[PDB]
Every structure is written in C-alpha cells, then in structure tokens.
Design a protein around this ligand. Structure first.
Ligand SMILES: [Br-]
Ligand SMILES: [Br-]
Ligand SMILES: [Br-]
Ligand SMILES: [Br-]
Ligand SMILES: [Br-]
Ligand SMILES: [Br-]
Ligand SMILES: [Br-]
Ligand SMILES: [Br-]
Ligand SMILES: [Br-]
Ligand SMILES: [Br-]
Ligand SMILES: [Br-]
Ligand SMILES: [Br-]
Ligand SMILES: [Br-]
Ligand SMILES: [Br-]
Ligand SMILES: [Br-]
Ligand SMILES: [Br-]
Ligand SMILES: [Br-]
Ligand SMILES: [Br-]
Ligand SMILES: [Br-]
Ligand SMILES: [Br-]
Ligand SMILES: [Br-]
Ligand SMILES: [Br-]
Lengths: 110, 110
C-alpha cells in the first residue's frame, strides 16, 4: 500500500505532484524542503523503488537525463494522503478558514 | 525543524492535530489509516520521542492512561507540512477546485 511509504518517498511523490521533473530537479526541491543536502546515494535508489511500485514513471530523455513523473497510481497516493491529512486538520471553522486561505493564496500566486 | 521526522511520527502528529487523544485512541486512528494493526511497541516509544522533541505533551490522567496533545511547536510542524504539501498540489485551477471540495466535504461532516 502507498500509505506505508517512507516520508522521503512520500515527499518525492509530492514534488512530482506539482509537475514532472528531472532527477536533478527533484533533488533541488527536496534540498530546499529539508534545508540540508540530499545525497545522490539516497534519492535515486528511492526513485527506482517508486518506479517498481508503479507510482512513478521514468522517461529516459536524449543523453543521460531522466524525467520522472507521477503515474495515475502515484497521483492517487498523493490525493489519498492529502484527503486524510485534511480530514484530521479541518476540525472546526477556524481550521477550515485557514486551509481555504492557504489554497486561495497559492492559486492566486500561479 | 521537524521535517526529518519519520512518516509514522508525522502521522501521530496529524492524529493529534484533530484533537488531543488518549494513547489507545491514537493507536485506533493510526490502524484505521494504515489498514493494519499498529503494535504497542511501535507507537509508545515514538510518542516518547515526540515528547522529548517538544512536539507532544503528555498528561498522566490515571494509571496506565495518558492523554497526548500537540505543543505549539507540534502544531507548527503539522501546519508546516500541510502548507508545503498544498504549495505543490495546488498547481492549477483543477487542483484548487479539488482541494476546495475536499475541505467543504470535511466541514460538512462536522
Ligand atoms: Br505501493
Ligand atoms: Br524518511
Ligand atoms: Br509523511
Ligand atoms: Br525539471
Ligand atoms: Br537524472
Ligand atoms: Br536540472
Ligand atoms: Br541524504
Ligand atoms: Br545511486
Ligand atoms: Br498529505
Ligand atoms: Br481519509
Ligand atoms: Br466548519
Ligand atoms: Br486554526
Ligand atoms: Br524535532
Ligand atoms: Br519514514
Ligand atoms: Br515510518
Ligand atoms: Br480520545
Ligand atoms: Br495511554
Ligand atoms: Br480509548
Ligand atoms: Br501534510
Ligand atoms: Br511552503
Ligand atoms: Br487558479
Ligand atoms: Br485535480
């Protein structure tokens, strides 16, 4: 099940939920999130795991540059965890208003 | 800085983001999420870690009965990951409408 993934693996799926990204690009996003370096020896072995699980698709582009993207299963895993997270956070009216402001501010910033 | 927590520890925080809960109640909420049994030996050592990290506060109500609640830092860690998750999910109008609908159905269930 996708609910048993590690936090690092779930964060990869989150990064790819925004848009498909080259391996090097995923590293940058994760490094910005964690605020610390992400070693090559950790990212790509986990990317391969997500590909084997059917959650991520690997597209080998021209020359040694790979683009990773969420599969339909991967996207469902991202939505599933978001729905559960929101089911626990939206516990009253103030919580709802907080999430709606976040969503609205993010969308306007697009 | 709680972005390095394990997925299991983060799920404990998410459970307590809804409301303070007894230890046994946390176990139930996690088992409903994972769809599998959560061992006593896995939950409580992680609760003790979250308490040592200052993210959860433990109140001993009775013998072998304790209630756990988020600290301010714990709640900040929950909102932090939700904000990052939403900043990546809300990538277009369709993504905004979906999250708006998720939040609306959660509020309706209250
Ligand atoms: Br899986
Ligand atoms: Br992890
Ligand atoms: Br997580
Ligand atoms: Br990219
Ligand atoms: Br690459
Ligand atoms: Br790049
Ligand atoms: Br690392
Ligand atoms: Br490697
Ligand atoms: Br989530
Ligand atoms: Br759910
Ligand atoms: Br409400
Ligand atoms: Br709030
Ligand atoms: Br921490
Ligand atoms: Br983990
Ligand atoms: Br874990
Ligand atoms: Br409870
Ligand atoms: Br307890
Ligand atoms: Br209980
Ligand atoms: Br989250
Ligand atoms: Br953010
Ligand atoms: Br929009
Ligand atoms: Br969508």
């Amino acid at each position: 099940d996708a609910r048993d993934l590690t936090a690092f693996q779930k964060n990869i799926l989150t990064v790819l939920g925004e848009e498909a990204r080259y391996g090097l690009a995923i590293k940058r996003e994760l490094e910005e999130y964690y605020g610390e370096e992400v070693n090559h020896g950790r990212l790509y072995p986990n990317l391969d795991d997500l590909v084997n699980k059917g959650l991520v698709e690997k597209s080998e582009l021209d020359k040694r540059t790979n683009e990773y993207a969420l599969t339909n299963e991967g996207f469902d895993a991202v939505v599933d965890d978001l729905e559960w997270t929101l089911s626990k956070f939206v516990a009253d009216a103030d919580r709802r208003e907080r999430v709606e402001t976040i969503v609205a501010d993010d969308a306007a910033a697009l």
